[PDB]
Design a protein around this ligand. Structure first.
Ligand SMILES: Nc1ncnc2c1ncn2[C@@H]1O[C@H](COP(=O)(O)OP(=O)(O)O)[C@@H](O)[C@H]1O
Ligand SMILES: Nc1ncnc2c1ncn2[C@@H]1O[C@H](COP(=O)(O)OP(=O)(O)O)[C@@H](O)[C@H]1O
Ligand SMILES: [Mg+2]
Ligand SMILES: [Mg+2]
Lengths: 836, 836
C-alpha cells in the first residue's frame, strides 16, 4: 500500500493500477517499463568503466546494501543498478548485451508478470536480470523450462553470467539423486522442469527425516514457456502412486476372532446408537489370543480400531440387507429396493472389515500417495513470473488462477513476416501433393523451409514423399531433444528442409544462417570444454570462436534473406490457435523477412473428429476438383469451430482438475504442516496433552448426556478408557471429567518418567514425535486410498438437481474430520502403551 | 359448420371440439365413438335375418340412396347401416365378426383420424367398414401398407369380404405394368405401398398422353401402419431420376459455329447490357450451315437460344476472369479476388455453352425428373386416415403436417403383459451371454420367445450361440416377407424360438397357439386354392377347415398360456422408444399373459455413438463386475438421452426434407396443371395468343424503355421480333405497342390457316398442344437439373446472419419465373415456325 511520485519502479499500489489497465488494453505499463529500461541505460557508463573483479564485487555490495538496517534498501531500490551490472556482465561474458526491450521484459518479470516476448527476442537472457536481482536476497530462484535438455542448457549458458557475478547456479534433472538435488536447490538460482520441482515438493512432504528434504521454500519462480506449462500441461496432476501396503493381515485376523467372541459376554451392541462396546472379558480374550498385554503395544497396529470394526461388521451390517457380495467385491445396496449403489464403500476401515468378514480375498492394490496439480504447486511461490511468445489469449485464465498479468513487450525490430491465409483441400491426398510441390519449389530456390505436422506417422509419410522427389531433409519427432536442437539450429540455412512433428525443436531459435550461440557452444563441447567443469578455458575459447562462427554464418544470412527468409509451412491445425501461431512465429525474428502458411484438409485429424467427411461429400456432389483450394465462409467457420471446441474442451478439463484438487489441497496443507512440526523436532508435549484431554473429554461426553444420574454407564466408560491409558481411580472413588483428567494427566507424568527410566533425558518428547508421525502417515495414506474411490464414483451421481462437486466436498471433508479424530485417539493410545 | 343435437355421427363444428379435447386427453371422443358402435350393435338383428343375396343387394340400395336427389342422404347417414352390413358380411365370410372396439376404430377412420389400436386388435379387419362405406361413393379408396407382401395379402384377404358385397378390390405391386395398374386403380378399393401410389403419381405427371394415366384422383387414403409410413419413411422423398436427355450435340455445334461468326458483321454486342443480337447475315449463315430454313423449324431444338448463348459465351464471358476451367469443370471466380465461387453455375444453358466454348467434354449425367415427399403426396387426398399400435407419441407431428388427430381405441380385453425394466451391462459380451441364458431357460420351460435385434450381423452371432447351446430357432432378416410371415405366424407355439432383425415379420400377428387365419389360408393355398382364382371352393374350404385349424391351435394356446404367454426379448434399443414399444406390443395381445424385456449394453451401437465407451471404462475402474446389471440414475439417463437424440435428429431431417420440398411442390402444381390441360385436349387458342401478346409487350417494353425521342433501337427490336414471327409491317409503316399486337394477330390468323391446308379443321389447336407440351417438358427438366445443383449448394452460402431456406426460395422462385418467361418466348417461336 505505497506511493509513487518520482519512484522509478512501481510499488504495489501503483503496480496494481498498472496491471488493471493491462487487461483493459491501455498499455500504460509498457510506457513505464520503457522508462525503467531507459534509466538503466543511463547507468551503462558507470558499469562499463569497471574492472571484471570490480563488476563481480557489485554482488557483495548489493547484499551488503540489502542487509543494511541503518540505511534500508529493497530489491526495487536496487533494480536499476543490479540490472545494469547483469547487463554489462552478459555483454562481457556472452558477447551479447541485452537489448532495451530485453530490459523492459526483465522489469516486467521482477514485478511478477508474464512478459510476452515473441520467438527470437531473447527470453533466455532476458531472464538473467530479474533472476540475478532476486537471487541477491539469498532465498533462491526457480527458473522452469519445458524439458531436461533445456533446463540443463539454460543453467549452463546463463549460468556463465551468474557465476561471473559470483552466484551459484544449479539444475535439477530426472536422473539426479536426493543429495544431488539438495545441492542444486542450495544454489542461488535453480533451473528445472515442473515435473522435477513438483515431484520434489511431493517427496519432501513424504520424508521421514528433516535431513532428507531437498527444497528450501517457494520464493520466486520464473516460468519460461508459461503457456505450455501453466496452461497446457496443467490439465494433468502430478501423482506419486504405490502399494497400499495395507493392514490386510489384521483385517483377516479380526474377521477370524469376531465369531469366537460372544454377544453380551465379550461385548455390547448399542442396537440404537449404531455402536459396539468391548467388555473387560473381551479385551482379555483378544489380549490372550494375540499373546499381548495391551491392545496398543504393537507400533503401527491399531488393534482397538480393527477389533471394533470386526464386531461392528458382525452385528450392525447384514449381508443381503445392507450390502451384497458379487465377484470378490462388497457392494452396497439401498433400503428395501436393494439396488446396487455402485461406487459407494464403507468408511474408516469398515469396508475392509466387511470384506474380511465375508471371507473375500482382500485386494493388493496401488494408490495415490501424494498429489498436487501444477496450478496449486505454482501457487506456492511468494512471487510468480513467466515468459512466452504467446500469452495474451490465456490472459483471463492466467489472471484468475495465478494472479499473473500479461504484458506485450514491443519487439526489437519491426516484425515484417507475411502470414498467409490457409489453403484448404477436400482430401489429405490433395493437400500433401500441394505441400510437397511448394516444398520442392522452395528448395530449388534455396529458401529454407520448416514443415510442421501433428503425428510422427504423417511426418514419416512426408519424409517418404520428399525422398521420392529427391529433396534432402530431416525429420524431428520430439523424441531426442539435444539431437533435434542440433538440426534445428541449422534449419535456417539455404537448402534447409526440416519436418518438425508436434512442436519439435522447441526452444532452439532458427536464426538465419545458423544459431550462432548454439553452434559456438556446440564446437566448444566437441573439443572437451564445459561451462562448469572447465570454465576458464571455455570462456577464453568462446571469445575467439564466436567471431568466427558469426562470419561463416551471417554472410549465409545475407543469402537466406534474399531468398525470402524462413518459410514456415504448417500441415494441420493444433489443438489451439495459439500453438498454430507459435509455429508461424519461428519465422521473421529480429525483423527478418519471412512467410508462413498452413495447408489444411477436410480429412485432417481435427476435421475427422467433427464434420469434415460431410463437407467432402458435399463438395464432391458440387463437382469441385480435389486440387482446388476452398474459399467459402462456411468451411472457414467449420475449421475455426473444430479447433475452438478442442480449446474449450481442454479449458474445461483444466477447470475440473483444479476444482477437485482444491478440496484435497486444503487437506494436505494441514497434514503437511503437522508432518513439518514433527520433522523439525518441535516440543509436542502440549499438543500431546491436549489430545489426551480431547479424547477423554469426548468419551466422558459420549457416555454422559441426559438422565444425569447414577442411571448412566460407568462400566462402559471405565473399560474403554482402561485400554487407552492406565486409569488410576475408581468409579467407586467418586460416587467427573475434571477428576478423570487429573488422573490421566498424572498417568502421563508417570509414563513420561518411565521413558526417562528406559531411554533418559527428554525421551518422552521423542516418543510423541515418533508416535504422531507414524499415526498421521498411516491414517493419511488410508484416507488417500478412500479419496481415490470417491473422486471416481462421484461423477456417477451428477443430475440437474445436484452438483457433484458439492457432494464430493461434504463427504470428503467429513471423511477428513473423522480421520483427524481417529488420529487423535490412536495417538493417545500408543502414547500410553506402545512398546519401546 | 353443422349442428349435433340428436346426431349420431359428429360432424363439422362438433368433430373439431372433439379433436381438440383429444390433444388434451379427455376422451369425450372415445365416449362418442362408443355411442356409435353401440348404435351399430342395435342394427345387428336387422342384417342377421337377411340372406346372402339380400345382403349383397344392400350395396346397390346404399348407392341409390346416396344419389337420390329428393330424399338426400350422406355417408354419415349411411354409416350405421353400412357398418352393420359390412360387419355381418365379415362374420359370414371370414368367420370373424368385428368387435365393438373394431367398430369404434372403424368410425374413427371414417372421420379422418388415426385410430391407435394395439397389436393384435385386428386392424386389417377394422379397415373394412370405413373402406366399404367410402367406396360406395364410387371414387376409389386407397389402403396403404408397408410392403408388397402385405398389400397383396390384405387385398386378397379383406377383398373376400368386399367381393361378397359386390365391390372390386385391386392391388398395385412393384411388378405390375401400367395396364395392370390402371385396372387396379379402377377397382372400388385399391391396396398398395407408398412407393407404388407415389411413383404412379409421378409417372402420371410425366405422361405424354391421357390414355396413359393409371390413377384416378386422391379421394380417401387409409394408411395402415401410419407411424411407419407418415413419420418414419417420410424422411426420404420419392425420386424418379434419369439421364438429362442431352442437348449436348447442339452445344458443341454452336461452339464450333460461334468462332466462324464475325463481330459487327454476323452480330452485335451490347457491352453495357450483357446482350447480343444476331444480324440478318448471321441468321442466314447459321441456316445454311445447318441445312435448315428457320431456327424455329425443328421441333424440340431451341436454336435461337443455343446460338445466342454461344455468342454470349464468346464475347461476354472471359476465361481466367469470370470463370476458370479445372478438371473439365467450369468454375466461376469473382472479379479480381480470382477465387472459386464454389457451388455456382451459369443460368439457362449458358454453362453448357461455356463448357462447349472451352472444348470441355460435356459429361453424360443424371438428374431428378420427378419428385414428391410422402408428406406432400398424402396431403393430396380429400380425406386421410390411418391405423397403428403406436401413434400418440407422434400426435403433434401428425396434426400439424397432415391435420390427422389421434384416438386411442380402448383395447378389446384388459392388457396384462408385464413390461420389465431394462437390464444394462458394461459390455455386449456380458449382455449376450446374459440373453442366451434367459432364452435357454425359457426354451426348456417351453415358453416361446421373440428376440429382437437390430442388424443382420447381430442376429447371426446370436443364432451361432443358440446353435452351440443346442436351441433350434429361426432367423428372420426382413428380407423375404412371405417366408418370414409363414414362420412368424407359428412363433407363439411351445418351444418357439424366433430371432427377428429390425422389425422382421412386421404385420403378422403372433397368436398364441398359431395365427389361425394365417394358417387356414396357408393350408388352403398349398393345395392350389386361391381366393380369386377359385373363389367358391376357397370359401367352402375356409368355413370347413378354420374350425379344424382353430381347434389344434388353441389347445396349444392353452399350454403356451400356462408357460407365461409370449416372451419378448429386445437385444438393443431402436432409433425411437416407439419402435421398442412396437416390439414389446407383440406379446400380450387380446388379454393374454406375457412378458417383455430388453437387454442393453454400454457397448451397443446406439451407445458407442455417444458415451458408452467412457461409462464402461469408468465402471471398470469402480471394479463393478461385468455380469452386474447397472442400476444408476446416471446410466439410465444416458441411454434415454442417446435414443432421444437420434429421435430428435430424425425429426429434424424430416422437417428439413419437407421445408425444402414446399418450394418445389408449389412449382410442380403449376407445371403439372399445365401439362394436364394439354393432355385433356383443352382449346388453347386464347392462351397461345396471350403468350404471343405477352412476348411482344415484353420486347416493346425492353426496347422502348426510356429516352423516348429519336434514340430508340427499332431495327434491333424488329430483328428480335422477326425471329419469333413473320412481321408484316416495316418499322417505317409509322413515321407502337398497339400496331405490333395487331399485325401479330393477323400473322397468327394466317398461320392458323396455313395449318388448315396441311391438316384441316383444328390443325392449329393440336399444333398448340404439341408445341407447348414439348416446350414445357424440356424447360422443366432443365430447371429441375438446375434446382438440384441449387439445393446441394445453398447450405454452403449461409451464416448465423442469413437463413439458407429463404435464399433457396428467393433464388428458386426467380429461376422458376425466368423459366416460365422462357417457355412463352420459345412457344410462340415454335407456333409460328415449326415444321409440320
Ligand atoms: N541481446 C542480444 N544480442 C545478440 N543476440 C541475442 C541477444 N539476446 C539473445 N540473443 C540470441 O538470440 C537467439 C534466441 O535466443 P533465445 O533466448 O532462445 O530466444 P527465445 O527463447 O526468445 O525464442 C539466441 O541465439 C541468442 O543467442
Ligand atoms: N373380430 C375378430 N374376431 C376374431 N378374430 C379376429 C377378429 N379381428 C381380427 N382377428 C384375428 O386377429 C389376428 C390379428 O389380426 P391383424 O389384422 O393382423 O391385427 P393387427 O394388424 O391389429 O396387428 C388375425 O389372425 C385376425 O384374423
Ligand atoms: Mg526460449
Ligand atoms: Mg397389421
Amino acid at each position: 500500500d505505497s506511493p509513487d511520485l518520482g519512484t522509478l519502479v512501481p510499488r504495489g499500489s501503483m503496480a496494481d493500477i498498472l496491471s488493471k489497465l493491462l487487461r483493459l488494453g491501455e498499455g500504460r505499463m509498457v510506457k513505464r517499463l520503457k522508462k525503467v529500461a531507459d534509466y538503466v541505460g543511463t547507468l551503462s557508463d558507470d558499469v562499463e568503466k569497471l574492472t571484471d573483479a570490480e563488476l563481480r564485487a557489485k554482488t557483495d555490495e548489493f547484499k551488503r546494501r540489502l542487509a543494511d538496517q541503518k540505511n534500508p534498501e529493497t530489491l526495487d531500490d536496487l533494480l536499476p543498478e543490479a540490472f545494469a551490472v547483469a547487463r554489462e556482465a552478459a555483454w562481457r561474458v556472452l558477447d551479447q548485451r541485452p537489448f532495451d526491450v530485453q530490459v523492459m521484459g526483465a522489469a516486467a518479470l521482477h514485478l511478477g508478470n508474464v512478459a510476452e516476448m515473441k520467438t527470437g527476442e531473447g527470453k533466455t537472457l532476458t531472464c538473467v536480470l530479474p533472476a540475478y536481482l532476486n537471487a541477491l536476497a539469498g532465498n533462491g530462484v526457480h527458473i522452469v523450462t519445458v524439458n531436461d535438455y533445456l533446463a540443463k542448457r539454460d543453467s549452463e549458458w546463463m549460468g556463465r553470467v551468474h557465476r561471473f557475478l559470483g552466484l551459484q547456479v544449479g539444475v535439477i534433472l530426472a536422473t539426479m539423486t536426493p543429495d544431488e538435488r539438495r545441492v542444486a536447490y542450495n544454489a542461488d538460482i535453480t533451473y528445472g522442469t515442473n515435473n522435477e520441482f513438483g515431484f520434489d515438493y511431493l517427496r519432501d512432504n513424504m520424508a521421514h527425516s528433516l535431513d532428507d528434504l531437498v527444497q528450501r521454500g517457494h520464493h520466486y519462480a520464473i516460468v519460461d514457456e508459461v503457456d505450455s506449462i501453466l496452461i497446457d500441461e496443467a490439465r494433468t496432476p502430478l501423482i506419486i502412486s504405490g502399494p497400499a501396503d495395507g493392514a490386510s493381515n489384521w483385517y483377516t485376523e479380526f474377521a477370524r476372532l469376531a465369531p469366537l467372541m460372544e454377544k453380551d459376554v465379550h461385548y455390547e451392541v448399542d442396537l440404537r446408537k449404531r455402536t459396539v462396546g468391548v467388555h473387560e472379558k473381551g479385551v482379555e480374550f483378544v489380549e490372550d489370543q494375540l499373546g499381548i498385554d495391551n491392545l496398543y503395544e504393537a507400533a503401527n497396529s491399531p488393534l482397538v480400531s480393527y477389533l471394533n470394526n470386526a464386531l461392528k461388521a458382525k452385528e450392525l451390517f447384514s449381508r443381503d440387507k445392507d450390502y451384497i457380495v458379487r465377484d470378490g467385491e462388497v457392494l452396497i445396496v439401498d433400503e428395501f429396493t436393494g439396488r446396487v449403489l455402485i461406487g459407494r464403500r464403507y468408511n474408516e476401515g469398515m469396508h475392509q472389515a466387511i470384506e474380511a468378514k465375508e471371507h473375500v480375498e482382500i485386494k493388493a492394490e496401488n494408490q495415490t500417495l501424494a498429489t498436487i496439480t501444477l496450478q496449486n504447486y505454482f501457487r506456492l511461490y511468494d512471487k510468480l513470473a513467466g515468459m512466452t511468445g504467446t500469452a495474451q489469449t490465456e490472459a483471463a485464465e492466467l489472471h484468475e488462477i495465478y494472479k499473473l498479468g500479461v504484458v506485450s513487450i514491443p519487439t526489437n525490430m519491426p516484425m515484417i513476416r507475411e502470414d498467409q491465409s490457409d489453403l484448404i483441400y477436400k482430401t489429405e491426398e490433395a493437400k500433401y501433393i500441394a505441400v510437397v510441390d511448394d516444398v520442392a519449389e522452395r528448395y530449388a530456390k534455396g529458401q529454407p523451409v520448416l514443415i510442421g505436422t501433428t503425428s510422427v506417422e504423417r511426418s514419416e509419410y512426408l519424409s517418404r514423399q520428399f525422398t521420392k522427389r529427391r529433396i534432402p531433409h530431416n525429420v524431428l519427432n520430439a523424441k531426442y531433444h539435444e539431437q533435434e536442437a542440433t538440426i534445428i539450429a541449422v534449419a535456417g540455412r539455404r537448402g534447409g528442409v526440416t519436418v518438425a512433428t508436434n512442436m519439435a525443436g522447441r526452444g532452439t531459435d532458427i536464426v538465419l544462417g545458423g544459431n550462432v550461440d548454439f553452434l559456438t557452444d556446440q564446437r566448444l563441447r566437441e573439443r572437451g570444454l564445459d561451462p562448469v567443469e572447465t570454465p576458464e578455458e571455455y570462456e577464453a575459447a568462446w571469445h575467439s570462436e564466436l567471431p568466427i562462427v558469426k562470419e561463416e554464418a551471417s554472410k549465409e544470412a545475407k543469402e537466406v534473406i534474399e531468398a525470402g527468409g524462413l518459410y514456415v509451412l504448417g500441415t494441420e491445425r493444433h489443438e489451439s490457435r495459439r500453438i498454430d501461431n507459435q509455429l508461424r512465429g519461428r519465422s521473421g525474428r529480429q525483423g527478418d523477412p519471412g512467410e508462413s502458411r498452413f495447408y489444411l484438409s477436410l480429412g485432417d485429424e481435427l476435421m475427422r473428429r467433427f464434420n469434415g467427411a460431410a463437407l467432402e461429400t458435399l463438395l464432391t456432389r458440387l463437382n469441385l476438383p480435389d486440387d482446388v483450394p476452398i474459399e467459402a465462409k462456411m468451411v472457414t467457420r467449420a475449421i475455426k469451430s473444430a479447433q475452438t471446441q478442442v480449446e474449450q474442451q481442454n479449458f474445461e478439463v483444466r477447470k475440473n482438475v483444479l476444482k477437485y484438487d482444491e478440496v484435497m489441497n486444503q487437506q494436505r496443507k494441514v497434514i503437511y504442516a503437522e508432518r513439518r512440526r514433527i520433522l523439525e523436532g518441535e516440543n509436542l508435549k502440549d499438543q500431546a496433552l491436549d489430545m489426551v484431554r480431547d479424547v477423554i473429554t469426548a468419551y466422558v461426553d459420549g457416555a454422559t448426556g441426559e438422565g444425569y444420574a447414577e442411571d448412566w454407564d460407568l462400566d462402559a466408560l471405565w473399560t474403554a478408557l482402561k485400554t487407552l491409558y492406565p486409569v488410576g481411580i475408581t468409579a467407586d472413588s467418586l460416587t467427573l471429567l475434571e477428576a478423570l483428567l487429573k488422573d490421566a494427566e498424572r498417568a502421563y507424568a508417570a509414563r513420561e518418567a518411565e521413558l526417562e527410566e528406559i531411554a533418559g533425558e527428554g525421551a518422552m518428547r521423542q516418543l510423541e514425535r515418533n508416535v504422531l508421525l507414524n499415526v498421521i502417515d498411516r491414517k493419511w495414506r488410508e484416507h488417500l486410498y478412500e479419496m481415490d474411490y470417491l473422486k471416481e464414483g462421484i461423477g456417477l451421481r451428477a443430475m440437474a438437481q445436484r452438483d457433484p462437486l458439492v457432494e464430493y466436498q461434504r463427504e470428503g471433508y467429513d471423511m477428513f474430520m473423522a480421520m483427524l479424530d481417529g488420529m487423535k485417539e490412536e495417538s493417545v493410545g500408543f502414547l500410553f502403551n506402545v512398546t519401546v
